[PDB]
Amino acid sequence: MKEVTIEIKNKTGLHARPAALFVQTASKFSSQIWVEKDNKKVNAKSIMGIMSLGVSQGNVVKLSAEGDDEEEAIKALVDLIESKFGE
Amino acid sequence: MKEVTIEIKNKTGLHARPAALFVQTASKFSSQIWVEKDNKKVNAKSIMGIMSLGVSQGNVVKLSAEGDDEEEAIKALVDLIESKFGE
């Protein structure tokens, strides 16, 4: 075994909540969901894609859903987004 | 189908790189890896756990690995951490 206690010194530590509550909400649904930023489409239920979209404060993205609950699911993400996630 | 183009207004947009390059490095290995912050253990290869550890700049965590490459794998995470991920 190999072990180290180390200090996290980068700005946002390991903060990733946004993509967190997002993917959590997006995941609660059966509707397939996508997030498109500048012609880059990614699965809204995948934290990786979200993180890879490099979406920052100020970015406009296209949120799409298609499924038996596509309406309630976008209302969510959108509502979640609109609160600033908290902030 | 339901679609909305919306602006991302929260601070860090959807920025989650840290947990990103971390889990990416941690995932490249066979050694099982853990991240323990204040007696909270989580799989270093799981972005969810990382994000849930609520690790911020300044936090000390315990990094452990156990496997055929446990040595090279901690050197990684540690080296990755030590650069501030970039910053």
From TrEMBL, chains A, B:
Places the protein is found: Cytoplasm
Keyword Cell wall biogenesis/degradation: no
UniProt cross-references to InterPro entries, sorted A to Z: HPr, HPr-like, HPr-like_sf, PTS_HPr_His_P_site
Entry-linked SUPFAM superfamilies: HPr-like
UniProtKB keywords: Cytoplasm, Phosphotransferase system
Pfam families membership: PTS-HPr (PF00381)
GO biological processes: phosphoenolpyruvate-dependent sugar phosphotransferase system
Designated name of the protein: Phosphocarrier protein HPr
Organism of origin: Caldanaerobacter subterraneus subsp. tengcongensis (strain DSM 15242 / JCM 11007 / NBRC 100824 / MB4)
